[PDB]
Design a protein around this ligand. Structure first.
Ligand SMILES: O=C(O)/C=C/C(=O)O
Ligand code: SF4
Ligand code: SF4
Lengths: 534, 532
């Protein structure tokens, strides 16, 4: 008991998040009861309060965003240095927030995995069944709202099925001092969750030349498949891999913003605003921008430097996609407090080649070949919808003798999946999905008469541009993210066509009007991303 | 239509299959009480200090049964190569020196990792992290361990903490009144072999997955001191949830999980693919660091639920310094997992090289032998690792010449633990060679680093520099840090950068140092058959 000083790794100057605006659930003070046991102050919390909080959290988060997420779209619209595509995407996204704020449609069709970061106090007593009540609140949120069941169960190593409730949830409940119960609810979409990268580097990385080249290199690997502008988060170091990958996501959700900006002899975590700006240079000098070239590739950056083993240096990269969905909350003696989000997003709000898709496919391919890559396109016609699990069955068909089905050859293939349908609505949120995940099917399906035109979001591999030039194909790129405004304004009629047992991932025929898209990969060999990402 | 199903449903959550020993006189730190009809437990927070102290002390000297049962199996198996028996015997012998409680099992005493599960009605005062850190502080300060943590004064300026703090303190909230623990001393090498891959649906088929495992296992190489406890996790709710699950699988925390999934997407062990990984490991021929069958002790494959668009896969290993201890505090006191106190019950050609000659006279002798030749070094070694190279390259990048100590003796990539009383040195095992690969061609172009001594395979950029500059890379046995200090290392002297802890520059006098020629001056590599 001498030269010992304890210093926690994370020492935030606002641990209880006072800078965040909270709203109180009306009549929630009845779910708590202050008691005194062995001289210490405790809080008997009704476990039903965990169900109600998760319900309101995972409901109101799919319709609203924080200020700094909307302040990044408006900045992308008003900044002169933003490309004409930067303003177009940011306006289309900011408009999608207004349609989503109407509480009828979710902000994105990928309602995301239910993630809960709970911190139960030493003297906060709920009965122990915290997970069951929290899961019931998530179960209530996705069953009684126009959300989507996104979780895939594993019956064995390969046989899979959907759960039908967007469960199970990531329930990481921590033990903390005190008697209060603090939360951070996250609905992390699949695309952003897939752009969480772990690199195991060495001491040779720790110098301003190498680290900058590392950032230049790794930021391009994120690409546009996670619907930029991103909230880029970067963590250098850590006590373990999982501690690094957990810290980078909390940085993306902006949980560690109140951390100090200087380290010490005790190895405390700290934000580095110097290199937060250096990260903003790489993002803005990349020219990748808002999905289609420009300056605003990232809303903002968060860089956290952690302690590390003398032999270890794990670094973590992750982003928060355009569907920035996180909510802070806490339960105390005063009741249930939940973070307020911007209810009115319109206050942040201040040439196209009409393509007919009702013509023969080869007559539509001829029209698209008349224009170079980067051409703004407005689709009007029929689209076939199919994604990963639908593709997995058609290749399984062709691997046994069955031919490529006819519906793949008639209309452009729209890599997407619909959310649940509201009452009196033509469809729920029906935004595009990551294109690069179905890259392995392009050359095969094109060799059998179909998939000549594909419609999705995100850059694709070189194997697709090669397959498109050979078979005379195209890859159309929709605006990734605006799933709500595409459902209300653009999508007019939806009809399940094949594999109805697959839920949202079935084969759908949809009639579409005024669908924004860009020609990024043509039948000649050009790619709109080869300048920014290759 | 709501049914709650937790992701992890272990059939032995409290780890009854693990044998626990009670700290004598620990029942005074607990008191069973009854509050609002439910049973609670007042735990003195000083009990957290004693448990963490005892845990991080006895874990550097003893191992579990299945870790020692894997070395004995590697010695007795007929299909094991003569090198498989040699490494497993040298490691198993190293445990006997370490079981003496004077020397740690490995020079890398590892990062202090604690997975605590405090019950809803387990009361400690809230200072669990402080008291757990004090117990870790006592363990590494009052024992012959090593301070492995590096603080960050800014983005690049660094310094050591001098106490092996901070610790990874992951305290979870669980029902009940008990406080259950898992103490881990994760070494650097095994912690650097934690890999996160973002894969797709196209991976989920027996053809792709088997070849995927074949592909990624080669990346582990021998740089993490095999035989490994290979762990593989397919799926997860997030990257961090996957990387957490794979490490617990490496520490064998999820062994009591079911073996079948259900419509609720519960986690489960896949014994079918646990063997498939063991086939690839045994059919790889990489073996115990130098070719053979026993590349891995055992495998653990866990299949998690996943997003319909996500498929995170996790790869991690537990190195030869497999250090984990389970514990729990209840009304009866402090119970801590028993490790094998007597490891000897699991226990059933060299080119003598003089290193006292001029360096070029020692390089000439090594060129007479092919790769894979067993060598016994006898002479002087210069010790330098990651931070020393970063400072010496900084010297040569500003005008200062390559220092004299780099050019005189073979470069020993290692770092010593603290020295016991009346001892020549503490544990002084080798370190991962691949981390100093970026300095070979530079240092060899300026007259030094012609002979390097470490463990683990290196990149092709080093084999080119060795053939070009006429150099060698000697491969020590990775892991036996205690038996190398007692038997092989006879005299140690700090040479430069004494503020760097283990990563300082050391001059050591060495006798009978086992090593293997893996990279010669011709372009050959003994791992090109197994790892390329
Ligand atoms: O595992 C390593 O390579 C590091 C060993 C050390 O701390 O010297
Ligand atoms: S906005 Fe894009 S990245 Fe985010 S969840 Fe929706 S589709 Fe995925
Ligand atoms: S046994 Fe090898 S990998 Fe494990 S800590 Fe020691 S040196 Fe590192």
């Amino acid at each position: 008991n001498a030269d010992f000083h304890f210093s926690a790794i994370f020492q935030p100057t606002d641990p209880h998040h006072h800078q965040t605006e909270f709203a109180k659930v009306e009549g929630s003070e009845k779910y708590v009861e202050e008691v005194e046991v062995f001289g210490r102050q405790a809080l008997k919390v009704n476990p039903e309060a965990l169900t109600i909080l998760a319900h309101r959290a995972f409901s109101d988060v799919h319709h609203f965003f924080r200020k700094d997420h909307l302040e990044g779209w408006r900045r992308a619209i008003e900044d002169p240095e933003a490309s004409d595509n930067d303003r177009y995407v940011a306006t289309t996204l900011l408009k999608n927030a207004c349609i989503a704020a109407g509480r009828v449609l979710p902000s994105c069709q990928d309602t995301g995995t239910a993630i809960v970061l709970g911190k139960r106090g030493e003297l906060c007593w709920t009965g122990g069944e915290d997970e069951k009540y929290l899961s019931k609140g998530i179960w209530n949120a996705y069953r009684y709202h126009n959300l989507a069941y996104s979780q895939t169960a594993a019956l064995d190593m390969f046989k899979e099925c959907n759960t039908g409730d967007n469960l199970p949830a990531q329930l990481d409940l921590l033990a903390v001092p005190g008697s209060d119960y603090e939360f951070l609810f996250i609905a992390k979409g699949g695309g952003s969750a897939n752009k969480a990268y772990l690199y195991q580097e060495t001491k040779a990385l720790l110098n301003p030349k190498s680290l900058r080249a590392f950032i230049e290199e790794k930021l391009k690997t994120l690409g546009t498949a996670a619907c930029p502008p991103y909230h880029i988060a970067l963590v250098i170091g850590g006590t373990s891999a999982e501690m690094t990958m957990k810290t980078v996501k909390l940085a993306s959700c902006r949980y560690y913003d109140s951390l100090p900006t200087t380290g010490d002899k005790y190895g405390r975590a700290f934000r580095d605003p110097e290199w937060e700006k250096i990260v903003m240079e790489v993002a803005q000098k990349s020219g990748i921008g808002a999905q289609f070239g420009g300056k605003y590739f990232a809303h903002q950056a968060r860089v956290i430097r952690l302690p590390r083993h003398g032999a270890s240096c794990p670094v973590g990269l992750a982003v928060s996609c355009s569907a920035d969905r996180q909510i802070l909350a806490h339960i105390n003696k005063s009741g249930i407090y939940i973070e307020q989000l911007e209810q009115n997003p319109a206050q942040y709000l201040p040439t196209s080649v009409k393509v007919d898709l009702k013509r023969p496919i080869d007559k539509v391919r001829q029209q698209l070949s008349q224009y170079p890559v980067g051409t703004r396109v407005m689709l009007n016609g029929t689209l076939i919808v199919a994604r990963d699990i639908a593709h997995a069955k058609i290749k399984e068909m062709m691997d046994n003798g069955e031919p490529l089905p006819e519906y793949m050859k008639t209309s452009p293939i729209y890599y997407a999946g619909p959310a649940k349908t509201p009452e009196g609505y033509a469809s729920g949120s029906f935004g595009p999905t990551t294109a690069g995940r179905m890259d392995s099917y392009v050359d095969l399906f094109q060799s059998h008469g179909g998939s000549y035109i594909t419609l999705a979001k995100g850059n694709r591999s070189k194997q697709v541009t090669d397959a498109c030039k050979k078979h005379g194909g195209f890859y159309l790129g929709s605006i990734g993210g605006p799933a709500a405004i595409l459902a209300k304004d653009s999508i007019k009629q939806v009809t399940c066509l094949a594999f109805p047992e697959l839920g949202m991932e079935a084969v759908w025929k949809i009639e579409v009007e005024d669908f924004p898209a860009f020609i990024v990969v043509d039948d000649k060999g050009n790619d709109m991303y080869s300048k920014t990402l290759a």
